[PDB]
Amino acid sequence: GPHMPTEVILRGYRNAQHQYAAINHYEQIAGRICEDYPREPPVESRRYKSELRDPAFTHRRALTPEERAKVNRAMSGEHWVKVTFESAEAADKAVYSSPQLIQGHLVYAEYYKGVPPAQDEAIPD
């Protein structure tokens, strides 16, 4: 069925330096995450961050209007991040798979319900 971008909270990782691992792992197991967050550890620099979208400056995937609207609703804390899966099916896989063990922490995936998590906290396994 037609892809409808679907927002999910990923939460419980050790600290903000572990956000990349939550995103990489859940993207790999569930499907594309539309945000341009890092998927590599911040142990050393890898890539320049740019918010340009002009194709004279980037040939990275152009977001659809529906994807862009949700990606622009950026939300995160120290131990959580809101992501936009490209489809409802991907979001459902993430939620079914939750929690996942990521660098010694249980990282939960929950549908976004209009509010941030009440607690911004790590969940050591």
**Residues 72, 20, 111, 53: what is their CA dihedral angle, to the nearest 10 degrees?**
20
Q: Which amino acid is located at 29 in the chain?
A: I
Phi/psi of residue 17, nearest 5 degrees: -70, -10
First and final CA of the chain: distance in angstroms?
36
Question: Which element (helix H / strand E) includes 9?
Answer: strand 6-11
Q: How many CB atoms lie within 10 A of CB 119?
A: 11
Distance CA 65, CA 40 (A): 27
Strand 100-102 versus strand 80-85 pairing type: unpaired
Method: X-ray
Q: Are strands 6-11 and 100-102 parallel, antiparallel or unpaired?
A: unpaired
Is 15 within 8 Å of 124 (Cβ atoms)?
no
Q: Is 74 exposed, middle or buried (0-12, 13-18, 19+ CB in 10 A)?
A: exposed
